[PDB]
RNA sequence: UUCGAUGGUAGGAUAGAGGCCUACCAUGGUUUUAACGGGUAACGGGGAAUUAGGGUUCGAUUCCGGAGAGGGAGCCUGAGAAACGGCUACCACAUCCAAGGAAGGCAGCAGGCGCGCAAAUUACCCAAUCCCGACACGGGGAGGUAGUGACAAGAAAUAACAAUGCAGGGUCUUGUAAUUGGAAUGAGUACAAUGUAAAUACCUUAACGAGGAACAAUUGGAGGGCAAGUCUGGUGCCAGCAGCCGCGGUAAUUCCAGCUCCAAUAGCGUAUAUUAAAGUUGUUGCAGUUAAAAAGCUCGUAGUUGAACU
């Protein structure tokens, strides 16, 4: 079973220290992967430039076009994939719009049927989504 | 998909849907009056009960 | 400057946000006592939990202990003075059986509503906000004024203001003009 | 209720001697002081430190070298 | 352990002990109780968040101690500095040059550029705390005060007294009011006193200051989780919605428009980090025949545990 001696504190502490690496949560914190190879170095949001738009296909059992775009980060140089939440915004969003990218809400995991996408766009041209949609704000003449 | 993208058919229903104007309505109390109105419509002026329905937004 | 000024939160959010057996009681209490929102309910629950926790930490010790005896009185005097406990019948176990209902009936708003001049607790709250209330020697402009057992006899109308006379005017003067 | 402090010096010399300047101005015993701004005073002090001596010698030497 | 690593003698240097340094003499010191090396997106602590308990995470930051003043190195003054709003030389930058030269360091208070998801005035004053000096008298971007904000905590505007018929209820009382009207009205407007170095503000001051755009409350959701529609119109596995399950192929309570309802409230949602739940780190308190998991087996030293009896 487990050691139960009064002088086995070192043995118990060492075994717990070795075994805690098997924990998925502890490993993801102690490896530093957020600052080592992750697209986001712990940042909640990051600015980027739109590269292109990709029509990803939904997985089973759904079937639709996800209306995604590809965005190149300006502070890291890593090319990632972005998801536009609403409908009819890919026409408004053109190349080089200075978009803002954030997480999806699954702690960096793909949400729903969208394959291989982990980020979502929040602002376009520095004005914010759902503002130009309701015709409250307008895209600057850039 | 694969190497394709439908950037032209997006927002079809939103673009083609009819648009109507919101119905006009006078002012409505907000705050403690709203709490009193909810209290007054909850159980002291029961109109939708019997069977435990407790419906506040019945369908028509 | 030299040291930070201590600040703290007084209201606590329940673990379950939409319990039916809890929301109905909170709505019933709010409607009965004319509370602004449920922030008052959270604050009262928080201080009651603090008092209950202190009493439990006291009661987990044996009797005749100097610490338990010293601290088991101070809470009793505070409760008796504030009127949360009755005029008598204390046994250092009544502290664990308090209710939000009695804590809320101990506020100044309940007392002014009970004496009257408003016909409703909402109008009593309006009176307490309008500074027309004369609770005690010093005017009180807060419904959450916990009133002791000594300041319940000085409550009446103000010398000034139309309800006390002194040339009301205002809307009366406007009607006189028109 | 209106509360405050009262400091009777039971004399005129004692009050006029041991009293803050703003308190003296409030009682209005003497006229106020009209001076330059704080920034102007500090800049004048800096220029005065930059110039060594009385100050008119620099003007005299400048006049000699430029006339 | 070369070029000091461990110890002895003697000397030098230091304000002072001391391999701090030097000459000689011995090979010593640490380490599986993890020495040494490497990483740390590591200044340390008082402390903070969650809270049955045990624990987990954070702590640049109002208090204490250490380091730095672009990176090093040296030095004068001074009791006290290896000082940078003291000096000197190199390294990387910036500047006037008449081309001979000269000259610096805001990780101080303000303000500018750039990196940025991310953070304020080129303001007033030494009046309060204290500091410095020859000293009641001077100075102090230490410090006090204010301008700016959505958020850090505490209190509360958006109402309310009646006549009125209907649904009523049981002669006392609630609601829909295309209704009235006299009331208490505070936000502001002005002024006076107080406040303060001067103010701002708070408190406080008569007095002007609602009959409806009165001086329009928002944020999300309304299938389960989890509370509130199978309601009316548009599309028809398309647009899309969607934290997961999941809805959509002409009856769509889950897509977008209207109506209403539910939750919090001048606040709500979203993205990320963390904590509880996680008895999925388990000393308390996990599990190992079949879900992940008993070394093929044995000996054996650290390590752990060790019959009774005074």
Curated annotation (Swiss-Prot), chain A:
CDD domains: Ribosomal_S23
Subcellular localization(s) per the UniProt record: Cytoplasm; Nucleus; Nucleus, Nucleolus
Keywords: Cytoplasm, Hydroxylation, Nucleus, Ribonucleoprotein, Ribosomal protein
Post-translational modification: Hydroxylation at Pro-61 affects translation termination efficiency.
GO biological process, alphabetically ordered: cytoplasmic translation; translation
Chief location: cytoplasm
Single GO cellular component term: nucleus
Superkingdom field: Eukaryota
GO MF assignments: structural constituent of ribosome
Positions of modified residues (3,4-dihydroxyproline): 61
Role: Component of the ribosome, a large ribonucleoprotein complex responsible for the synthesis of proteins in the cell. The small ribosomal subunit (SSU) binds messenger RNAs (mRNAs) and translates the encoded message by selecting cognate aminoacyl-transfer RNA (tRNA) molecules. The large subunit (LSU) contains the ribosomal catalytic site termed the peptidyl transferase center (PTC), which catalyzes the formation of peptide bonds, thereby polymerizing the amino acids delivered by tRNAs into a polypeptide chain.
NCBIfam families: PRK04211.1, uS12_E_A
Assembly behavior: Component of the small ribosomal subunit (SSU). Mature yeast ribosomes consist of a small (40S) and a large (60S) subunit. The 40S small subunit contains 1 molecule of ribosomal RNA (18S rRNA) and at least 33 different proteins. The large 60S subunit contains 3 rRNA molecules (25S, 5.8S and 5S rRNA) and at least 46 different proteins.
Miscellaneous remark of the record: There are 2 genes for uS12 in S.pombe.
Family statement: Belongs to the universal ribosomal protein uS12 family.
Swiss-Prot record, chain B:
Coarse class of the protein's main subcellular location: cytoplasm
Pfam family, one: Ribosomal_S30
Record field: transmembrane: none
Assigned GO CC terms: cytosol; cytosolic small ribosomal subunit
UniProtKB keywords: Cytoplasm, Ribonucleoprotein, Ribosomal protein
Region feature (Disordered): 1-35
GO BP terms in the entry: cytoplasmic translation; ribosome biogenesis
Molecular function GO terms recorded: structural constituent of ribosome
Keyword ATP-binding: no
Function: Component of the ribosome, a large ribonucleoprotein complex responsible for the synthesis of proteins in the cell. The small ribosomal subunit (SSU) binds messenger RNAs (mRNAs) and translates the encoded message by selecting cognate aminoacyl-transfer RNA (tRNA) molecules. The large subunit (LSU) contains the ribosomal catalytic site termed the peptidyl transferase center (PTC), which catalyzes the formation of peptide bonds, thereby polymerizing the amino acids delivered by tRNAs into a polypeptide chain.
Annotated family: Belongs to the eukaryotic ribosomal protein eS30 family.
Entry-linked PANTHER family: 40S RIBOSOMAL PROTEIN S30/UBIQUITIN-LIKE PROTEIN FUBI, RIBOSOMAL PROTEIN S30, ISOFORM A
Protein name: Small ribosomal subunit protein eS30B
UniProtKB/Swiss-Prot annotation, chain C:
Single Gene Ontology MF annotation: structural constituent of ribosome
GO cellular component terms, A-Z: cytosol; cytosolic small ribosomal subunit
SMART domains for this protein: Ribosomal_S4, S4
Pfam families, alphabetized: Ribosomal_S4, S4
Localization of this protein: Cytoplasm
S4 RNA-binding domain ranges (all copies): 106-178
GO biological process: one example: cytoplasmic translation
Superkingdom of origin: Eukaryota
Main localization of the protein described in the UniProt heading: cytoplasm
UniProt-listed InterPro entries: Ribosomal_uS4, Ribosomal_uS4_CS, Ribosomal_uS4_euk/arc, Ribosomal_uS4_N, S4_RNA-bd, S4_RNA-bd_sf
Note: There are 2 genes for uS4 in S.pombe.
Description of how the protein assembles with itself and partners: Component of the small ribosomal subunit (SSU). Mature yeast ribosomes consist of a small (40S) and a large (60S) subunit. The 40S small subunit contains 1 molecule of ribosomal RNA (18S rRNA) and at least 33 different proteins. The large 60S subunit contains 3 rRNA molecules (25S, 5.8S and 5S rRNA) and at least 46 different proteins. Interacts with snoRNA U3. uS11 interacts with MPP10. Component of the ribosomal small subunit (SSU) processome composed of at least 40 protein subunits and snoRNA U3.
PANTHER family: 30S 40S RIBOSOMAL PROTEIN (PTHR11831), 40S RIBOSOMAL PROTEIN S9 (PTHR11831:SF5)
Family that this chain belongs to: Belongs to the universal ribosomal protein uS4 family.
Name of this chain's protein: Small ribosomal subunit protein uS4B
Lineage: Eukaryota, Fungi, Dikarya, Ascomycota, Taphrinomycotina
Curated annotation (Swiss-Prot), chain D:
GO molecular function: structural constituent of ribosome
One BP annotation, GO: rRNA processing
Spans traversing the lipid bilayer: none
Region Disordered, annotated ranges: 33-67
Predominant place of localization: cytoplasm
Disulphide bridges, residue numbers: none
Domain of life from the UniProt record: Eukaryota
Subcellular localization, as worded in the UniProt entry: Cytoplasm
Keywords, in A-Z order: Acetylation, Cytoplasm, Ribonucleoprotein, Ribosomal protein
Ranges of compositional bias, category Basic residues: 38-50, 57-67
GO cellular component: cytosol; cytosolic small ribosomal subunit
Annotated function: Component of the ribosome, a large ribonucleoprotein complex responsible for the synthesis of proteins in the cell. The small ribosomal subunit (SSU) binds messenger RNAs (mRNAs) and translates the encoded message by selecting cognate aminoacyl-transfer RNA (tRNA) molecules. The large subunit (LSU) contains the ribosomal catalytic site termed the peptidyl transferase center (PTC), which catalyzes the formation of peptide bonds, thereby polymerizing the amino acids delivered by tRNAs into a polypeptide chain.
SUBUNIT field: Component of the small ribosomal subunit (SSU). Mature yeast ribosomes consist of a small (40S) and a large (60S) subunit. The 40S small subunit contains 1 molecule of ribosomal RNA (18S rRNA) and at least 33 different proteins. The large 60S subunit contains 3 rRNA molecules (25S, 5.8S and 5S rRNA) and at least 46 different proteins.
Family: Belongs to the eukaryotic ribosomal protein eS24 family.
Protein name per UniProt: Small ribosomal subunit protein eS24A
Native source organism of the sequence: Schizosaccharomyces pombe (strain 972 / ATCC 24843) (Fission yeast)
Gene behind the chain: rps2401
Shown stretch of the complete protein: 68 to 134 of 134
